[PDB]
Amino acid sequence: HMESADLRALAKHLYDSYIKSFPLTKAKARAILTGKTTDKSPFVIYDMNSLMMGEDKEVAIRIFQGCQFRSVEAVQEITEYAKSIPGFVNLDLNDQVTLLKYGVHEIIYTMLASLMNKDGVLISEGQGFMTREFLKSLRKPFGDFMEPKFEFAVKFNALELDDSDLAIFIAVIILSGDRPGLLNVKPIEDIQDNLLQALELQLKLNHPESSQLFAKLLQKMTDLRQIVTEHVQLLQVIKKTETDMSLHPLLQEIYKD
Amino acid sequence: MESADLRALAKHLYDSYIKSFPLTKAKARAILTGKKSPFVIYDMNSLMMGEDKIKFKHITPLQSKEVAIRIFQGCQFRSVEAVQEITEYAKSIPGFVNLDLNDQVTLLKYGVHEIIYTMLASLMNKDGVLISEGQGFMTREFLKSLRKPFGDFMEPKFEFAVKFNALELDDSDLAIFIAVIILSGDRPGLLNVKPIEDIQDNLLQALELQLKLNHPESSQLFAKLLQKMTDLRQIVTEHVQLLQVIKKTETDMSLHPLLQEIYK
Ligand SMILES: O=C(O)c1ccc(-c2nn(C(=O)c3ccccc3Cl)c3ccc(Cl)cc23)c(OCc2ccccc2)c1
Numbered sequence: 001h002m003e004s005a006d007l008r009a010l011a012k013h014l015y016d017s018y019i020k021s022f023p024l025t026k027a028k029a030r031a032i033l034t035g036k037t038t039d040k041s042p043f044v045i046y047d048m049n050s051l052m053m054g055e056d057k058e059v060a061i062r063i064f065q066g067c068q069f070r071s072v073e074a075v076q077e078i079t080e081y082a083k084s085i086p087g088f089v090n091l092d093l094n095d096q097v098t099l100l101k102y103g104v105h106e107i108i109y110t111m112l113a114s115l116m117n118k119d120g121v122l123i124s125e126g127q128g129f130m131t132r133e134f135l136k137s138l139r140k141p142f143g144d145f146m147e148p149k150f151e152f153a154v155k156f157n158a159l160e161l162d163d164s165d166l167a168i169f170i171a172v173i174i175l176s177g178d179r180p181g182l183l184n185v186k187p188i189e190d191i192q193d194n195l196l197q198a199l200e201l202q203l204k205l206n207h208p209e210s211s212q213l214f215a216k217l218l219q220k221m222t223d224l225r226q227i228v229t230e231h232v233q234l235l236q237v238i239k240k241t242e243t244d245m246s247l248h249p250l251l252q253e254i255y256k257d
Numbered sequence: 258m259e260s261a262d263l264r265a266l267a268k269h270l271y272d273s274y275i276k277s278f279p280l281t282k283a284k285a286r287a288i289l290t291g292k293k294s295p296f297v298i299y300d301m302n303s304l305m306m307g308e309d310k311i312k313f314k315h316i317t318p319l320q321s322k323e324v325a326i327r328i329f330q331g332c333q334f335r336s337v338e339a340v341q342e343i344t345e346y347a348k349s350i351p352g353f354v355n356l357d358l359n360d361q362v363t364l365l366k367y368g369v370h371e372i373i374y375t376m377l378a379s380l381m382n383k384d385g386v387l388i389s390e391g392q393g394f395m396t397r398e399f400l401k402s403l404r405k406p407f408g409d410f411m412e413p414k415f416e417f418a419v420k421f422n423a424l425e426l427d428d429s430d431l432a433i434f435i436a437v438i439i440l441s442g443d444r445p446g447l448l449n450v451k452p453i454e455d456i457q458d459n460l461l462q463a464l465e466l467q468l469k470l471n472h473p474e475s476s477q478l479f480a481k482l483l484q485k486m487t488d489l490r491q492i493v494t495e496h497v498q499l500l501q502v503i504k505k506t507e508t509d510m511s512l513h514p515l516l517q518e519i520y521k
């Protein structure tokens with residue numbers, strides 16, 4: 001258990017670290033998506049020609065490779081954020097690897113929702129915007145690989161969470177005591193209890209009209225687990241189909257077992 | 258919603274849960290701890306004797322003679338029997354019968370799998386499972402040891418149960434939790450999501466308060482119980498994949514066609 005002023009201090013600590021670790025914030029992403037600004041307007045990629053012009057090997061692959069490159073970048077930013085979570089770096093080292101192995105993907109989809117609306121996703125630190133249409137229309141398995149992310153984002157974004165909320169929620173995901181192969185579950189759950197308490201109080205003060213948002217947000221962790229599972233199975237199909245294509249070692253290790 | 262209203266809802270659901278389900282968790286734990294001794298099925302010979310002596314309804318011979326198949330089919334028979342108990346309990350949830358009839362059917366169709374896994378945990382410990390309203394006890398080792406895919410079909414249930422039971426929920430907790438599962442607004446094909454999520458919001462409030470008063474020492478048990486809905490969705494998805502593999506591999510399975518229709 002934790003006292004109220006301590007929970008507020010924990011939320012601010014985590015928000016502060018989240019700002020320092022993730023360069024493209026939800027607040028910034030929404031300002032770019034909403035427009036009414038002449039200085040932050042993205043170039044829109046909606047077909048092959050605008051893709052060619054936007055840049056100033058096969059297209060579905062190039063886009064896929066672009067996604068993997070950005071995901072590796074996200075794993076780095078998420079890893080840096082995790083170190084800031086009080087108690088994380090004090091855990092057994094093998095458990096640190098384990099929590100990150102199973103948590104980074106759930107966080108990537110979570111934070112990817114910040115870059116999405118129902119019509120597309122921001123890319124290249126907000127400078128570009130690729131339409132859901134164009135991604136959904138990619139050939140072979142790649143088209144169907146993009147759309148389920150949009151489906152989750154539309155539902156997740158309906159919760160209207162801001163960055164200060166997401167900062168604690170991401171922490172809760174990482175500090176999951178039910179990951180396979182964890183050696184010392186007890187110290188992980190003690191931290192998650194602190195984070196969960198901090199999330200609860202945070203949501204109450206920041207969304208007081210939004211009844212049971214706490215519970216509704218935790219139920220979204222179920223959606224996350226599903227899409228991470230869907231993702232892995234699609235990668236295996238691409239691995240057996242496109243054998244000229246290579247994954248980053250960091251990603252390679254993450255998906256082993 | 259006021260605190261006294263939440264307790265009234267909780268008590269309402271508990272009373273109905275007692276009436277709808279034959280073997281409560283409270284009773285099951287009395288049998289499992291040894292506190293009227295159940296017949297124990299731990300191998301082939303004891304199975305033969307129990308079905309001759311006790312005569313368990315879901316594991317009487319009926320087309321197939323192979324044991325592992327009969328046990329597998331017996332689990333499905335009991336699951337279909339459970340669906341009716343859950344359906345009757347759902348009728349008691351305030352607001353449920355007022356929902357669109359198609360929506361009632363949709364909530365039950367996609368929810369029963371999660372509820373069965375949940376309530377099966379009440380009947381399990383790390384060593385086995387109660388059957389036939391507590392009269393029998395089938396050991397985990399005997400179930401795990403069934404041949405080809407059948408043994409591996411049984412074990413994941415125990416693995417979930419053991420983890421779930423560590424929350425030490427009681428029937429009054431479970432009655433509200435089961436209600437929350439039923440009123441899931443994200444089921445495919447729902448026509449009117451709003452009144453479903455409004456009811457679930459009431460139930461979640463009632464569940465939260467129940468857990469605070471029933472388990473004040475158990476910090477964030479609410480959140481931890483909500484995290485188990487992930488495990489449920491996961492194992493239910495796995496369950497489907499295992500049935501499909503058994504369906505394409507096992508042709509010793511055919512039952513009387515009317516039986517196939519009932520237990521589809
Ligand atoms: O900025 C960001 O935080 C961030 C995080 C993620 C993804 C992403 N990964 N991604 C993947 O397949 C993937 C995810 C996790 C691990 C490995 C992979 Cl391989 C996507 C599939 C579809 C979509 Cl719509 C997005 C992604 C991301 O895509 C931006 C992008 C889209 C199109 C072309 C180039 C880049 C951005």
Ligand SMILES: O=C(O)c1ccc(-c2nn(C(=O)c3ccccc3Cl)c3ccc(Cl)cc23)c(OCc2ccccc2)c1
Pocket residue numbers: 315316328331332333335336339369370373374376377380386387388395400410411414
């Ligand atoms: O009484 C009870 O509430 C109740 C609820 C459940 C199951 C059950 N379903 N079951 C299933 O495949 C199943 C089918 C659909 C949905 C969920 C499930 Cl989980 C089992 C698999 C293994 C085991 Cl060990 C038990 C079950 C149950 O099994 C009693 C039983 C055990 C052995 C042989 C015959 C019957 C009892």
